[PDB]
Amino acid sequence: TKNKDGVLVDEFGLPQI
Amino acid sequence: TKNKDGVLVDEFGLPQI
Amino acid sequence: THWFHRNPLKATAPVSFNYYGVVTGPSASKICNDLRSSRARLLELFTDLSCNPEMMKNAADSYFSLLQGFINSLDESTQESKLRYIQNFKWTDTLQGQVPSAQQDAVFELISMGFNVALWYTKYASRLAGKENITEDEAKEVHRSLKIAAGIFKHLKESHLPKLITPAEKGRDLESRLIEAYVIQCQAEAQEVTIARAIELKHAPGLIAALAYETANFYQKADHTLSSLEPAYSAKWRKYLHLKMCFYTAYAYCYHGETLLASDKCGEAIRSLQEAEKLYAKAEALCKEYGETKGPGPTVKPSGHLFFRKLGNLVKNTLEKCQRENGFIYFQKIPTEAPQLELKANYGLVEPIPFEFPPTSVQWTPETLAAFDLT
Amino acid sequence: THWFHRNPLKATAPVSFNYYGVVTGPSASKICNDLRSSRARLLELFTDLSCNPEMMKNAADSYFSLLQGFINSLDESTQESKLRYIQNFKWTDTLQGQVPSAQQDAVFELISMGFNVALWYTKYASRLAGKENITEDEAKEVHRSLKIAAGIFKHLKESHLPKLITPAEKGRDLESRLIEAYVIQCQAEAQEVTIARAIELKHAPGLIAALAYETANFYQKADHTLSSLEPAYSAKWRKYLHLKMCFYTAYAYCYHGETLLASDKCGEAIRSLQEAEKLYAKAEALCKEYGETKGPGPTVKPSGHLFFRKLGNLVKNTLEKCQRENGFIYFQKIPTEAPQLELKANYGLVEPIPFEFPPTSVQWTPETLAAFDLT
């Protein structure tokens, strides 16, 4: 899962690492 | 040297350690 | 440990679905028995503590796939079900105590029952969330349930309320402003969970401060939505909301101070932190002001501060670094105003999970429907 | 390091004691040569770095016992010497700059000269106490030089000043209030030496706080005594005393807070420390206002703080202990008033060394006196 900025994202929507 | 209370004092009037 | 205030479940009058003369034939007779039983089951479940989301989902689909035979036309060719006004339904309300409300419409029943399932979801969420140990896939469960609940309330509101022929009174669950408030509290509460995670996982202070501030806003919007209601019934609820607003505004100020400290602004760091500690001590006030306020729903207590942990550590780091500039215990060159937080959360905001009622049961056939003679 | 503000030394015009026809025979005319040379020698030592108390004590003793024949009677019949008004003496004043003042009174000479000697001992003590190398026996030397200077001044004020026929001129060294201001400062400065010693030997906090409190009081009490003076000449010196009072009230609250912390009173320790830090900031502002006030003598700078050493640690120990029911940063619950200090020093209080002028020189006889023959 990535957001509109292409940032890898947590199941809660927090950034991965 | 001893103050009125019989406690030993140094030259500066401070107690002796 | 998370603390969620819960207004009570709605209670409804038992429905037999026994139509006597109106009912002619085995199929219509059998579909009325299944309505009666699928409803009785769903109702028994609401109070079952051994019930989980897979059980509720199953009971809910069964009943609602049958119930919609009373609502939607089968083959089209007509508008609604000729059976919509056949039965009188009676439900209590979350804020209204023992004073029920009754409409003879199937949509009233649909909505009211859908309102209870969604409530049950938020309740299943707070029971679990209240547990001390709380694994990570238990937290996901809590988070997901709040999201489902939110999605249901929203669906009921947007795609359903309009269809009701008589408008719900103020203070009633079926009025638009109230439902909107549940949606927001469901969202705000899911983010409390995300915030607990962001903190344990040691995410950036800017991310946690933004999410903390966004959550407080959701509480202020829910509170402002409930503002137009009668203080009699809404008073205690709105207290808890305003309480949470403070609680989370303080967390914003705490993690913002850390932001201002890393950017090496000492005066404003100290001030933002003074703010964090001030609001929290106030939130402990509203907590008791809330406990002794009278209204629908039980009283809950926070305890469990992970807050002072973080504050104490920030304060140390800040004092070591900032002293010799702003002073040791008596602080100088401190901004006279707390900074106004305008903060936007790019991570962790909760959308409701989109909800849809199931298709009308295939058990509803023109033949079964014709076996209903309203004469 | 110790820093003691110093007003300039008094200066005088040379005196030859040449009376020509008046003086007769070797005895009398030999006395006038001894006075001439003793005064001359005593005047040189004032400006000589070489000079120590042993040398000064001897020079002054010699000159004064000779000049004592211009004041006292030899016989006990008469109250006073017939030579008292024979010589015009001229002296400047610590606060009056270049402008001198004359009186033809031998007592005016005794007090102006004796005053300078006193002034010398304090200057000798300040050079000394200014060293970083400073040793114990040297520290004691400073303590003592100050107590001697004090006792001298006191003696002028008490037993001598009353005897001048010319009435006291405000701003001049020879008026009561101002001599009293010097007497106090000297005691105040001897106690600072002791305070440094007590903080270095790690004496009890209560003992230090009390001796610091009593010291600030002497400084306040000095500033008060000078309040009668015109601002032009007295402004800088008064700004100094005010500065020294603040510095030591800071120390009082600081070390007193430690007392309080040990007694487990947190909101008070916190409040005591905040007043300490607050007064120190005040003292720093005064130190600036002091550096910028024009007036007698050069400005001095404190530097050399041990203060936030002690302060940083008490603040650290107080918070570590007191977060609890008080901290962390925005503080509750703290007394609005600073804890009032009535603290009584059982140790370190300095009293002047009682001083007296030498009796009349053995060179003075009814005969050698009669060899003067005014007429």
Q: D244 preceded by cis ω (within 30°)?
A: no
C203 touches chain A (CB under 8 A): yes
CA distance D117 to C209: 70
Report how far residue D178's alpha carbon sits from residue C91's, in angstroms, rounded to the nearest whole number.
Answer: 95
Classify residue D102 by its DSSP letter. E
The CB-side HSE value for C36 (13 A sphere, CA atoms) comes to 11
Contacting residues of B for D347, CB less than 8 Å apart: 3, 9, 13-15
Which DSSP state fits C226?
A: G
Element (H, E) at C173: none
What is d(CA D76, CA C209) in angstroms, rounded to the nearest whole number?
Answer: 94
Q: Report yes or no on chains A and C touching (3+ CB pairs under 8 A).
A: yes
Asked if C348 and A9 come within 8 Å (Cβ–Cβ), the reply is: no
Q: What technique was this entry resolved by?
A: X-ray
Q: Which residue's entry shows tokens 């009669």? A: D370
State how far the alpha carbon of C272 is from the alpha carbons of C50, C268, D126, in Å: 46, 6, 48
Any idea which fold C1-375 has? 1.25.40
Q: Is D353 in CB contact (< 8 Å) with chain B? A: no
Residues in B touching D193 (Cβ below 8 Å): 12
DSSP 8-state assignment for residue D365: -
Query: With 0-12 CB in 10 A as exposed, 13-18 as middle and 19+ as buried, what is C161?
Result: middle
Resolution (A): 2.7
- Non-local (6+) Cβ contacts of C303 within 8 A are C1
D348 Cβ under 8 Å from any chain B Cβ: yes
- Do chains B and D touch, with touching meaning 3 or more CB–CB pairs less than 8 Å apart? yes
Contact D101, D167 (CB under 8 A): no
Q: Which positions ≥6 away from D52 have C-beta within 8 Å? A: D124
Q: Hey, what are D30's tokens?
A: 């030999």
Count Cα neighbours of C360 within 13 Å in the Cβ-side half-sphere. Answer: 17
CB D157 within 8 A of CB D124: no
Is the Cβ–Cβ distance between D107 and D79 less than 8 Å? no
- ∠ Cα D315 D321 D325 (to 5°): 110
Burial (0-12, 13-18, 19+ Cβ within 10 Å), C304: exposed
Residue D102 pairs in a beta bridge with: D90
Render C118-163 in DSSP notation, one character per residue: HHHHHHHHHHHHT-SS--HHHHHHHHHHHHHHHHHHHHHHHHTGGG
- Who contacts D142 (Cβ-Cβ below 8 Å, separation ≥6)? D2, D125, D126, D128, D129, D190, D193
The CB-side HSE value for D293 (13 A sphere, CA atoms) comes to 25
* Residues D191 and D350 sit within 8 Å (Cβ to Cβ): yes
For chain D, which residues make up each domain, given as ranges?
Answer: 1-375
CA of C373 to nearest chain A CA: how many angstroms apart?
A: 52
Give CA angle at D66 (D60, D67), nearest 5°.
Answer: 85
Whether C110 contacts C160, CB under 8 Å = yes
Which secondary structure element, helix H or strand E, spans residue C90, and what is its range?
Answer: strand C89-91
Q: How far is CA C47 from CA C121, C179, D372, in A?
A: 12, 22, 128
Q: Does D143 touch chain B (CB under 8 A)?
A: yes
Q: Does A6 touch chain C (CB under 8 A)?
A: no
- Backbone φ and ψ for D243, nearest 5 degrees, come out as -60, -45
CB pairs under 8 A between B and D: 30
C267: helix, strand or coil = helix
Q: Cβ distance D38 to D66 under 8 Å?
A: yes
Sign of CA dihedral D42, D46, D48, D50: positive
User: What gap in Å lies between CA C139 and CA C192, rounded to an integer?
Assistant: 11
Residue B4: closest C-alpha in chain D: D346
Mutate to test the interface with A, among C138, C142, C202, C346 (most CBs of A within 10 A): C346
Distance CA C293, CA C243 (A): 12
Q: Are C266 and C321 in contact (CB under 8 A)?
A: yes
A–C interface: beta-carbon pairs under 8 A: 27
Task: Return the partners of chain D (3 or more C-beta pairs < 8 Å).
Answer: B, C
Q: Identify the CA nearest to C19 among candidates C90, C86, C73, C103.
A: C86
- List chains touching A (3+ CB pairs under 8 A): C
Residues of C with Cβ-Cβ distance to A14 under 8 angstroms: 194, 197-198, 201, 203, 207, 347-348
What's the rounded Cα separation, in Å, for the pair D183 and D119? 11
Q: How is residue C68 annotated by DSSP?
A: G
Q: Report the C-alpha gap between C350 and D80 in whole angstroms.
A: 105
- Residue among D83, D63, D60, D158 at smallest CA distance from D372: D83
